[PDB]
Ligand binder design. Structure first.
Ligand SMILES: [Zn+2]
Ligand SMILES: [Zn+2]
Lengths: 173, 442, 619
DNA sequence: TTAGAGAATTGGAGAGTGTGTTTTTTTTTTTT
DNA sequence: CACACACTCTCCAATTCTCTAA
């Protein structure tokens, strides 16, 4: 997936392989092997072939791929881009209002009289009133380096769809 | 939307933007590493598609997941990918420059197919994005060390204890002009243009039609119009068996009183034709009609400033006030007119420069008025070697005729009121088409 | 919490300061009626600008202590005032939208200090100083938010600038690889910044001292508002910063470099249908042509036709080679009125320029290429003829320009372009400039034994390009001297009422010329065409005597230009016989002044070639 | 069955080491 | 040179493995 770094429904190598299987008609032979009672020793192998055919897909999305899905997904992509962009703009404005409208080196320091520092004296704050408006006592800190044996597990896959023609073929299969 | 150079604020960073500007300097084309392919020196795995930003960056972890190496890498130049790269200095175009202000300059960077399409002096529209470029001299990396008035940022590991400044650069993805061979002609000529040039070729008395169309403001002087039209069409240049050239361009001189239409002919020719040059006999630069040698303080070294004939190479040079040259130009004109070259041999430069040019000279006779009792040789001061260069001499004399004066006044006035056989674009297309023919001699 | 905040080691409470400034905004109705700054915050809603200018005098008059706190502690107080203004701008007009938080910009109207007397006790105070800008740097991009991305796993994060430094992440939160977060420069966020070097005004200097200078820094939305050569009262914070001894070492010099963190500029030397109807009514006034020609140059005496020609030049002909720019030459002794007239008239038009024909000119006539000193890159510095592409270029001491300047000016006047092939640049710059010239005699005095071309020693190739040539020598008449002396005495006794009348005339003259340029486009009438043809044929019929040439067609084109200019003066939009007869009159008078051989009077060959017949018949 | 105390293994913070850091004369071409 | 990069080397201690009591 460094080289197959491919977008939502661009045909991956696996998609092209499945489409080649469809065009060659070997899917019909796999169906014959699974449906026929005469050669059931190959049923385990054919199960393995089918399990390797379906890897990106999940059944709930696959069963709903009607013939008119392409136009729907065009409009859905435009809507998703619109909401993503609006969300990013909102996040940008929250960050912009968090910091001040003066430049970074515009100095000035404050004392919060009612708030003890880690010592006995009151805390001296340097990042401006706009950072004090929503004050947090970990603004300047970095995260901790959790060790390797303590780190949480992560997802081995992300849901790129296969190409729509391949999705139609897989639904029919 | 087209933005001015003044509007390229930091708020424009990263946005698609269009600007207009005049190119000042163009640097050499270089290969720029877009993405490196690297070899890990202690497990021999290759890492592909290593993106670069600005400092040359080798990868910071090995692609082999169990490998501990983070510094010992070797670039594979043969399997790495490069793009053609050029940077050009532009400045504010003449229309955009504010009053009483220094011209603001900008570094544009061109890539891939755009790396030589714009040259210095051209007014060009650039489309691309304003980007920020770091002071790469301040950044140390595993690939390469640092190479060391404002403050700049601080705190990066790669930056060390130094501080990083920034500068604005316009990364141009496209460039075009702001106002715009036989294979090229055959491809460019559309069916209407083919029919037009064919009809013109079969046009009977195309001679007089083109004379009238090309010189409508001129009254009379049909012979001079015909001669200058033949100058535009020109002869066939040839090369002898011994590699020595034979001149194909003709040269035309028009002597007349300062009160006549000699300058009008030159102005019409230079307005009409492409690649042509207008100049006076006196030079508006150290170089004149021919090249001159000048120091530049960038090296304190001699180079050649080009003259009008070289700028008019493979074209037409209209030379008004032809009788009042400097001696340097007047002597070098001997070689340029016939041999179609200018052979400079001075300190720091030896060069045989090309001047394959047709010359349209305009001259003033001695004492202003052309004296018919005197010969033309007695009327002008041009030496006999110079006079032998010209293929045609034409004389314009200001007659005192009442009807001619009324006709001249009427032509000027009614032409000036009219502004609000063939168009000049049609004549341009036909002339460019016709100049590809090389007539034999029966 | 706001009430707990106090400026560091200062005992000034931030919440009290904010509420006091809100009270100032609420109550200040009396600059000499809604509050003035709430009126401005009503205006800002539709104007859309992100700033509110406020006067420190008003703050001081409202509350001495608030003004003192502002002056003493601007670094904390001005952000507090910004918060106050942004609270008020949503207390009033709560549904408004603005792209940026409002920045308050306090200023005192006059200087509080002069830059020679700045002291370390003034560090971090709010001050304002007067000065002239010497240089203005490129727009510096200054970072305000650093965007980091993991090289391994593409995880991204954003970190604010602390005090110019960056808190680099050191480990990626989504994959725990150390030293894997890389700064993506173009995904980071930047503000505008610019350096301005300010010199004290000449009048403020001590006797014979060289200028002091101070460095200014102007940030986002206030960045490019000043140019070199202008004058400003600039308000800002007097900062002092350390400078490192070497770029690779963090040791700093004990002596701190100082600069002005700019908050406000105020330029001090830069300065409708009612205008349209006033100009339209004035165009119908009787002898409006003489009225405008008399309004030109009130300090100059009696030069009626010269001023009339200058007026027609300033109006110009009809644009559409069809050069509409009228060329004028003034000719006379040194020290006479022509130089004063040029220095007056160049500032009377937009796009105008003034320069000397000598090598001491600040902006030369020829284009050239130079290394821009602040960056040491090539820049194409165009000349005055090119910078005045649609205006008047006033060339003083015209006569003694060198031969290269003569050639390039011939090129500009004939072709209306300037070609340059200097340093790899090859281009043909536009120059549709109206050349106005002032030429001296070669010797100290005019020589009536000789004509203009022989006295001034300029070529006919340049003199024939001029539409009109005028003589500015004064008569030797005692009546003329007495009238001139009375006029000069009146100039000495010029007072405020005459000054206001002259400035009113100047304002309406500028507006009239600009409007005529903007809307009027004269075109030929049939009687104009007949009159022009008749004029050229008549002035050519003079050549029947002596077999000489008495005119040439460029004279006709000059008359066309002058007639169109006169039609534009009276806003006719159609040029007719009244304009053509005035053009003929002024043109004939110009030739009478300039082309007069002393032995025979006016003769046209003097302009065509040097050495008229009475001179050339020596041989 | 679930949770706390003693022992074992490995991350990395810190110390040490090595390396890196205008102004004058003479010529040449062209400007007057 | 004395003040910064880059690398090696040392021991401290942070977290897990295994045995035991509640
Ligand atoms: Zn490796
Ligand atoms: Zn990561």
């Amino acid at each position: 997936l460094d080289q197959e770094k491919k977008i939502d429904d661009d045909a991956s190598a696996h998609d092209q392989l499945l489409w080649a299987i469809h065009l060659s008609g070997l899917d019909d032979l796999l169906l014959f092997l699974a449906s026929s009672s005469a050669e059931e020793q190959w049923s385990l192998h054919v199960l393995e072939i089918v399990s390797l055919m379906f890897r990106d897909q999940n059944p709930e999305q696959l069963a709903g791929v009607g013939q008119g899905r392409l136009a729907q997904e065009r409009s859905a992509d435009f809507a998703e881009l619109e909401v993503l962009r609006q969300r990013e703009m909102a996040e940008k404005k929250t960050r912009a209002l968090q910091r001040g409208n003066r430049h970074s080196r515009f100095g000035g320091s404050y004392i919060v009289q009612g708030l003890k520092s880690i010592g006995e004296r009151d805390l001296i704050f340097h990042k401006g009133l706009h950072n004090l408006r929503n004050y947090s006592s970990d603004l300047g800190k970095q995260p901790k380096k959790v060790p390797k044996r303590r780190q949480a597990a992560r997802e081995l896959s992300i849901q790129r769809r296969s190409a729509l023609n391949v999705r139609l073929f897989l639904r029919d299969f | 939307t087209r933005h001015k150079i003044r509007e390229l604020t930091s708020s424009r960073i990263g946005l698609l933007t269009r600007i207009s500007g005049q190119v000042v300097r163009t640097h050499p084309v270089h290969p720029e590493l877009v993405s490196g392919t690297f070899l890990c020196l202690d497990c021999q795995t290759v890492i592909r598609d290593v993106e670069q930003q600005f400092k040359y960056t080798q990868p910071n972890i090995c692609r082999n997941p169990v490998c501990a190496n983070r510094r010992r890498f070797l670039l594979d130049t043969n399997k790495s990918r490069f793009v053609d790269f050029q940077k050009v200095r532009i400045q504010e175009t003449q229309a955009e420059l504010p009053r009483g202000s220094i011209p603001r300059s900008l570094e544009v960077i061109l890539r891939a197919e755009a790396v030589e399409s714009a040259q210095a002096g051209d007014k060009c529209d650039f489309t691309g994005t304003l980007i920020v470029v770091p002071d790469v001299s301040k950044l140390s990396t595993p690939g390469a060390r640092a190479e060391t008035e404002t403050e700049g940022i601080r705190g990066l590991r790669a930056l060390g204890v130094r501080d990083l400044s920034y500068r604005l650069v316009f990364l141009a993805c496209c460039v075009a002009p702001t106002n715009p061979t036989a294979e090229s002609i055959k491809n460019q000529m559309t069916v209407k243009e083919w029919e037009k040039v064919f009809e013109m070729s079969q046009d009977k008395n195309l001679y007089h039609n083109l004379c009238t169309s090309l010189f409508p403001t001129i009254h009379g002087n049909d012979e001079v119009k015909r001669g200058v039209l033949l100058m535009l069409f020109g002869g066939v240049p040839k090369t002898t068996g011994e590699g020595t050239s034979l001149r194909g361009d003709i040269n035309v001189c028009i002597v007349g009183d300062p009160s006549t239409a000699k300058s009008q002919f030159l102005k019409h020719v230079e307005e009409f034709s492409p690649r042509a040059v207008y100049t006076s006999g006196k030079a508006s630069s150290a170089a004149g009609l021919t090249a001159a040698v000048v120091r530049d303080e960038e090296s304190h070294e001699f180079v050649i400033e080009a003259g009008a004939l070289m700028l008019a190479d493979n074209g037409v040079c209209c030379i008004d006030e032809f009788d009042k040259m400097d001696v340097r130009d007047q002597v070098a004109i001997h070689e340029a007119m016939e041999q179609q070259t200018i052979s400079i041999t001075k300190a720091g430069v030896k060069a045989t420069l090309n001047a394959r040019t047709s010359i349209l000279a305009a001259a003033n006779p001695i004492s202003g008025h052309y004296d018919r009792s005197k010969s033309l040789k007695q009327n002008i001061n041009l030496s006999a070697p110079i006079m032998s260069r010209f293929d045609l001499f034409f004389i314009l004399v200001d007659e005192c005729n009442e009807v001619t004066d009324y006709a001249i006044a009427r032509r000027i006035v009614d032409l000036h009121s009219r502004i609000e056989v063939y168009s000049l674009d049609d004549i341009r297309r036909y002339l460019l088409f016709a100049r590809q023919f090389k007539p034999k001699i029966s | 919490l706001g009430q707990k905040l106090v400026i560091w080691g200062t005992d000034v409470n931030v919440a009290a300061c904010k509420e006091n400034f809100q009270r100032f905004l609420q109550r200040f109705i009396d600059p000499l009626t809604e509050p003035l700054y709430m009126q401005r915050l009503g205006e800002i809603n539709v104007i859309g600008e992100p700033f509110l200018n406020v006067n420190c005098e008003h703050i001081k008059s409202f509350d001495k202590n608030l003004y003192r706190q502002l002056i003493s502690y601007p670094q904390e107080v001005i952000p507090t005032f910004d918060m106050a203004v942004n609270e008020i701008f949503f207390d009033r007009y709560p549904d408004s939208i603005l792209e940026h938080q409002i920045q308050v910009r306090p200023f005192n109207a006059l200087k509080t200090k002069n830059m020679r007397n700045l002291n370390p006790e003034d560090i971090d105070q709010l001050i304002t100083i007067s000065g002239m800008v010497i240089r203005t740097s490129q727009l510096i991009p200054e970072m305000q938010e650093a965007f980091f991305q993991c090289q391994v796993c593409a995880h991204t994060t954003r970190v604010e600038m602390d005090r110019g430094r960056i808190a680099e992440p050191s480990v990626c939160g989504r994959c725990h690889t150390t030293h894997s977060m890389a700064l993506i420069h173009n995904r980071s966020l930047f503000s505008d910044k610019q350096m301005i070097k300010l010199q004290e005004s000449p009048e403020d200097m001590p006797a014979g001292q060289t200028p002091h200078t101070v460095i200014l820094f102007a940030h986002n939305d206030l960045v490019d508002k000043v140019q070199p050569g202008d004058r400003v009262n600039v308000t800002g914070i007097y900062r002092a910063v350390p400078i490192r001894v070497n770029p690779r070492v963090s040791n700093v010099k004990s002596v701190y470099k100082t600069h002005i963190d700019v908050i406000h500029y105020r330029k001090t030397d830069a300065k409708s249908e009612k205008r349209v109807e006033l100009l339209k009514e004035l165009s119908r006034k009787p002898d409006i042509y003489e009225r405008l020609a008399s309004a030109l140059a009130p300090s100059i005496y009696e030069h009626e036709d010269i001023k009339k020609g200058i007026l027609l030049q300033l109006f110009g002909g009809t644009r559409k080679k069809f050069r509409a720019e009228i060329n004028i030459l003034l000719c006379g002794d040194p020290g006479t009125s022509k130089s004063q007239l040029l220095q007056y008239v160049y500032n009377l038009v937009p796009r105008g320029q003034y320069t000397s024909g000598k090598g001491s000119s600040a902006v030369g006539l020829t284009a050239y290429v130079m290394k821009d000193p602040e960056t040491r890159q090539l820049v194409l510095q165009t000349g005055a003829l090119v910078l005045s592409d649609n205006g008047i270029c006033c060339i003083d001491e015209f006569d003694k320009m060198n031969e290269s300047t003569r050639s390039v000016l011939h090129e500009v006047m004939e072709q209306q372009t300037l070609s340059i092939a200097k340093a790899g640049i090859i281009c043909q710059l536009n120059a549709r400039t109206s050349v106005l010239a002032a030429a001296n005699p070669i010797e100290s005095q005019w020589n009536p034994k000789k004509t203009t071309i022989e006295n001034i020693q300029l070529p006919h190739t340049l003199l024939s390009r001029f539409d009109l040539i005028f003589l500015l020598l004064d008569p030797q008449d005692e009546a003329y001297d007495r009238r001139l002396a009375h006029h000069l005495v009146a100039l000495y006794y010029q007072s405020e009422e005459q000054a206001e009348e002259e400035l009113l005339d100047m304002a309406v003259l500028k507006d009239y010329i600009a409007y005529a340029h903007s809307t009027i486009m004269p075109r030929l009438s049939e009687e104009a065409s007949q009159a022009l043809i008749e004029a050229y044929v008549d002035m050519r019929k003079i050549g029947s005597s002596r077999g000489m040439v008495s005119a040439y067609p460029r004279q006709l084109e000059s008359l066309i230009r002058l007639a169109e200019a006169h039609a534009k003066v009276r806003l006719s939009n159609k040029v007719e016989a009244i304009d053509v007869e005035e053009a003929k009159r002024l043109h004939r008078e110009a030739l009478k002044q300039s082309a007069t051989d002393p032995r025979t009077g006016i003769v046209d060959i003097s302009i065509l070639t040097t050495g008229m017949s009475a001179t050339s018949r020596k041989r």
